[PDB]
Paper text:
The K+ uptake system KtrAB is essential for bacterial survival in low K+ environments. The activity of KtrAB is regulated by nucleotides and Na+. The KtrAB system is composed of the transmembrane KtrB dimer, each containing four structurally similar domains (D1~D4) arranged around a four-fold pseudosymmetry axis normal to the cell membrane, and the regulatory KtrA octamer (tetramer of homodimer) with a ring-like structure, known as the RCK gating ring. ATP binding to KtrA octamer activates K+ flux activity of KtrB, whereas ADP binding inactivates it.
Mg2+-added and Mg2+-free ATP-BsKtrAB cryo-EM structures (Structure I and Structure II) are virtually identical with an r.m.s.d. of 0.30 Å over 2104 Cα atoms. A clear region of unassigned cryo-EM density between the two adjacent ATPs at the intra-dimer interface was observed in Structure I. To minimize the uncertain effects that Mg2+ may cause on the structure of BsKtrAB (Structure I), we hereafter used Mg2+-free ATP-BsKtrAB (Structure II) in comparison with ADP-BsKtrAB (Structure III) for the following structural analysis.
Numbering used by the authors:
A (entry chain D): 7 to 156, 160 to 201, 205 to 220
B (entry chain F): 7 to 156, 160 to 172, 179 to 192, 205 to 217
C (entry chain H): 7 to 139
D (entry chain K), E (entry chain L): 15 to 445
Write the structure that this text describes.
Amino acid sequence: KQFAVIGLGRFGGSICKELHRMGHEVLAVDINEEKVNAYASYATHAVIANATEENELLSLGIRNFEYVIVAIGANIQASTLTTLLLKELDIPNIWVKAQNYYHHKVLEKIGADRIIHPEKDMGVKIAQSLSDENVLNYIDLSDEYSIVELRKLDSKSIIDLNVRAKYGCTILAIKHHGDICLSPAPEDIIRELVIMGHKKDIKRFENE
Amino acid sequence: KQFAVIGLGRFGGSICKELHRMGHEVLAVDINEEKVNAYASYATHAVIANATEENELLSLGIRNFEYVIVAIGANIQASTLTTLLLKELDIPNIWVKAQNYYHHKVLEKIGADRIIHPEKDMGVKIAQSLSDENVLNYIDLSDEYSIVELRKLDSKSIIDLNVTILAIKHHGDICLSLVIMGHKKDIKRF
Amino acid sequence: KQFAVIGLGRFGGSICKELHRMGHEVLAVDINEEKVNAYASYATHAVIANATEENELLSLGIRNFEYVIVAIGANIQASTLTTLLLKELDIPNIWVKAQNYYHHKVLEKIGADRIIHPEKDMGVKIAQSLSDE
Amino acid sequence: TPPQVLAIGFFLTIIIGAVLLMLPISTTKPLSWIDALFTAASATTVTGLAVVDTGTQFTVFGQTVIMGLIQIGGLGFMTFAVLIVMILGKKIGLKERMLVQEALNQPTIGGVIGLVKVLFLFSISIELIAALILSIRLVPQYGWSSGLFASLFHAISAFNNAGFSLWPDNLMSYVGDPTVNLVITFLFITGGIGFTVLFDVMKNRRFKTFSLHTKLMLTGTLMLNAIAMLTVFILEYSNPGTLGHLHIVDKLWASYFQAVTPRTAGFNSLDFGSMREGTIVFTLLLMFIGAGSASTASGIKLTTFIVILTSVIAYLRGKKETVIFRRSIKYPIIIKALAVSVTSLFIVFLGIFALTITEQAPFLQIVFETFSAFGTVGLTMGLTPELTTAGKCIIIVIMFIGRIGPLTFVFSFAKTEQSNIRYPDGEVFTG
Amino acid sequence: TPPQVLAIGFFLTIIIGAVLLMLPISTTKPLSWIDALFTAASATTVTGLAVVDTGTQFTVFGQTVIMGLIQIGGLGFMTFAVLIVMILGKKIGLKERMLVQEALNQPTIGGVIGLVKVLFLFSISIELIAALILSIRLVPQYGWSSGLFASLFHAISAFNNAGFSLWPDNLMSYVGDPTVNLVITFLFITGGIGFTVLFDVMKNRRFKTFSLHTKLMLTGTLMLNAIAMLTVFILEYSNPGTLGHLHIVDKLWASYFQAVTPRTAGFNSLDFGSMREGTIVFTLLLMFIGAGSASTASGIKLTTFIVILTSVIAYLRGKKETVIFRRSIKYPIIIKALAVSVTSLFIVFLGIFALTITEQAPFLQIVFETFSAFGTVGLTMGLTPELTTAGKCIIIVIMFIGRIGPLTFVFSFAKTEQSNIRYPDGEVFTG
Ligand SMILES: Nc1ncnc2c1ncn2[C@@H]1O[C@H](COP(=O)(O)OP(=O)(O)OP(=O)(O)O)[C@@H](O)[C@H]1O
Ligand SMILES: Nc1ncnc2c1ncn2[C@@H]1O[C@H](COP(=O)(O)OP(=O)(O)OP(=O)(O)O)[C@@H](O)[C@H]1O
Ligand SMILES: Nc1ncnc2c1ncn2[C@@H]1O[C@H](COP(=O)(O)OP(=O)(O)OP(=O)(O)O)[C@@H](O)[C@H]1O
Ligand SMILES: [K+]
Ligand SMILES: [K+]
Ligand code: NA
Ligand code: NA
């Protein structure tokens, strides 16, 4: 697996550092010299290049990468022309960071395999946490079912609450001072919690 | 025939590539390094120079070219001073890309052999196509006669209509003796 | 004698070319690289320097010149600090190009030996020609 | 002045060492003023050129003074000055820290005192271990008093890239011995690779984490030694004087030893006087190039040679930048490497020119001697014992400038004044 | 390809000249394939190294072929190609004009065809006048048929910096003659100063109006000749072999002649084989440096030597820019001069290395021969007649690369691809 990350910003630079940490060959490309110097130690290869130029793109041997990540999300012209070149160069997987809804529509027309909205996805997740302070983190399995990680419940056993059949949600795990429990069979003492269930049913539990 | 093209834009770069394709010696001059690098393969010689400087103009041997094309149409000062230098250097043919009407007037005073309005000429031709969707392309022979290339006419013989029809295109096949030549008013009647 | 012309503009460059044509040793100083290259052939010595810095002024041997002409006439700060340095360096003759009336007064205070108004003086001669044509 | 302190301090160590060697206690036979000055200079510059035999001319005390001069010269004058200051309780100031940066050729003063602590601790440790490894071999041959001192002397001599030997034949009796060949070669390869390189491979232990300088030295040394070993073996295979009447196993040892000793230790196992001129010509280039930049070796460093060579190759291929290991090399690095190379070549040319005037010797020996002295290598073709007093004085100057570095030597007597004025561009054809 | 046309065209002139010299008409004694190829290469590269005596081996027709090869090589292949094209009525195109710019090492194509017209007209004019001046002296000694041809041969040989001589002793019988000394020295000093320099002094006639390149060549040549003349006179004053048994008036002539002939004519009046090694060492540096950039002389040009030397001195004094004659010298000039100097030194090193392997000759003669061949000087210490066939082949390659220039030769077989990508800066210590 050889990965190319084009554009070293907050999003693109984070991908380079994480992939390099996992032990992958990463080519970091950016048009700004200061960015490339900073990430020269966090990538296998770091090049100062303009990704909108076909000659510079071919000078990098970009055809040797299965995955190319275009992490340019504030320059629509630079973002769309880069992915147009990569599609012309027959890159199998092209993942692009989109700016707005109109940028997303263009990238879908010119063939971006995956389109990413980092700030928009995080903003929705943060806004869910603001609305319900109990909700610490959640993953949306579907449009009606989700897994949500959450003093009345304190000193209460699992068998004490019968939300298993009434509310209809299964308690996946409970965190006890840095200790996790898998398949918690009642009764276990709850001390001042991961639950899977229907989205409406989960809200019922938070009420009581 | 040795041609010099000064200024490598959409218009100047198109002239360099077309002349080079036809097999001509083209000198491509531009003040921007990135432009010169791009067209270095589409010209016999490509130089990064300021055409408003006489010393740089003489360093190129510009006197050896019969035709010089000044394709700078957004910098009036750079365009007019370049052609003033070329006229002083006794270049036989100087063709200049003009920006507006006032730029055209200045270039006529300082002796430009031919003045070109690329966008203005195309805009008039496009606007003719917009007005009449039937009109695909046309050449104006005069101010009253022109050749215009164009379901009622379908399945109709030439002798069926008693309206000169220069040629008709049949699925990529052309016939000599829908292209029609006639008076401008008469063409609109058809 | 030796002349130093600081600031190669329309007025400063015209002094260098005329003095160099007459066969005089002229030092041309300008903070702009393009100006110095253009006047390299029209001066005995052409240097890219900032005249407001004393160290750069001493690097040129400015004390060797009897006449120094400050031909900066649009930058009052650069013009007045240059002639302040030259007055400190005990230059016998300092001729400065003034911008307006207030610039003229400042230069007269800080010891400019002669103050020149090229555009203002020509504008009066042209106006006289227009009135009586 | 930091360059001035380096020159003044290094020059004093030559005079102090010369006085000690000229004492009746440190010598067995009468010693001339020039020979004592030459031997001290050859030791503090860690060159190894020997007018008189070290084993016979000097006594045990004299050889101990030689070890002190070798150790002081190998690690540098400022390395010991900081340690003495540190032990006396005095803290290193900003002015003193700038001297250490200049002495170690460091671009920044960041952690330069910590580098001195590491390199000295590493130096004494590796020499002590190497002495023990040499002791087991050298004890049955010379007993205990002589055997232990011989191993200690050669371990210090090898690590510092000195080439001094107590035996009359410098290591020529250990051609086939793997222990002496492996230990001594390992000493001056690591001693000359560079202190910064060793420190980098100590903390970091994966190649991709090494700095650009460390990667250049490790790959450059391996490639340069491999090319040298092949050249010596092929050219000298059928030479009766050297490498001819030897077994294939001994041929590989001698070829390997004579490929790494020019940079810049100066030990030998074959007679360079009987080698073919083709091998000598390649050795001239070999010992003009040195080893790591901040180390016990001298000459133009291996990185200086690579930086210039890559810069030229980049120009010949139309490239606008010098790139090694996917890193661009800036103009200040290029100009410094060119200043080092041009000044070094000019000094060698003057030494060859001066020696031809002074002495009536074959030209090849004069050229070999000057390159050997300037690189502080110490290899000889037989000219050093035959040098006249004027010739010895020239070699002393060449050895001194070679060790201190031509740039630092010039910076000592050249004053730099900063001028902010520029000049219009001039055109000149340099074809 | 412009560099490729220069190499291909120059190589063909060697083969064509070799065939003509190997014909029975152009020779008196049987001539080997290698000697014919060597003589043709030595003439078209305008070097002057002579395996066989020109006066005896070749006939008048053969010597006429030598003059043609000397004239073609001295002015360059492209100089005559343009003239032939111009006479045939064909106009010079842009592609052809670019070849002339490459051949003349010109930065711009501005007025490069006019330069060719001037330099050829100047060349034939000055040689014809010089032949007439030499004719009055050389007619009473050799009659009319031989005397006129001898003067014409030497005038063409001198102006083109060839060093070919019809007499067995190359100009050794005219040591005290002022006419031969003045005319011949004036021919190769002006022939090698540079065509652009001569053109500049023709139109402009005041020193302050000269370009930077012209001022460097005029002042550099005067200073370099003055230093060389003093060195030869002082070192060779008491040498019995050369300059010893001569009058003071003849000593000054011979010292002056031997100071300017290494750059790069190759005539002699004294025997370089009997000179002291100190004078030979200085001559090595003298003929490694050449003369004007666009001229009939070779080697690294005098401006290349000055640009590098001034750039190093500027660095050693802390200055951030290289300034000569109140003009700053840009980085592209510095890097090109470095590429010229490094590639030239590497080629000379290979030639010395190759010659030592091939031939059993004293090292000084091998070094002198390689520097003489690469600079296309032609001075010998006695090695050229003793070269083996393999040794002659090496010299032919060295002479060919020296005349064409190491940069143009490398550009012939090196393809340049433009990449706009840059790399992060890397740090490396080049002390
Ligand atoms: N043509 C280009 N080729 C390569 N890199 C480019 C190009 N144009 C911009 N970049 C770089 O891509 C990076 C990301 O672009 P930019 O900062 O505009 O986006 P962003 O959406 O604000 O980024 P982020 O939110 O990840 O910080 C920047 O470091 C920028 O310099
Ligand atoms: N002084 C100059 N000398 C040479 N080239 C110049 C100069 N000034 C501008 N150019 C170049 O001329 C080209 C065309 O100029 P410009 O972009 O201003 O005109 P334009 O009318 O917008 O062009 P086009 O419509 O053909 O794209 C550009 O590539 C520009 O860099
Ligand atoms: N500090 C300085 N040192 C040297 N030269 C300077 C300095 N500041 C400005 N100059 C130069 O002085 C010249 C004249 O200055 P400027 O153009 O502001 O004046 P001006 O009144 O417009 O002149 P002019 O009418 O003569 O064209 C310019 O070439 C400018 O670059
Ligand atoms: K040594
Ligand atoms: K010659
Ligand atoms: Na963002
Ligand atoms: Na346009």
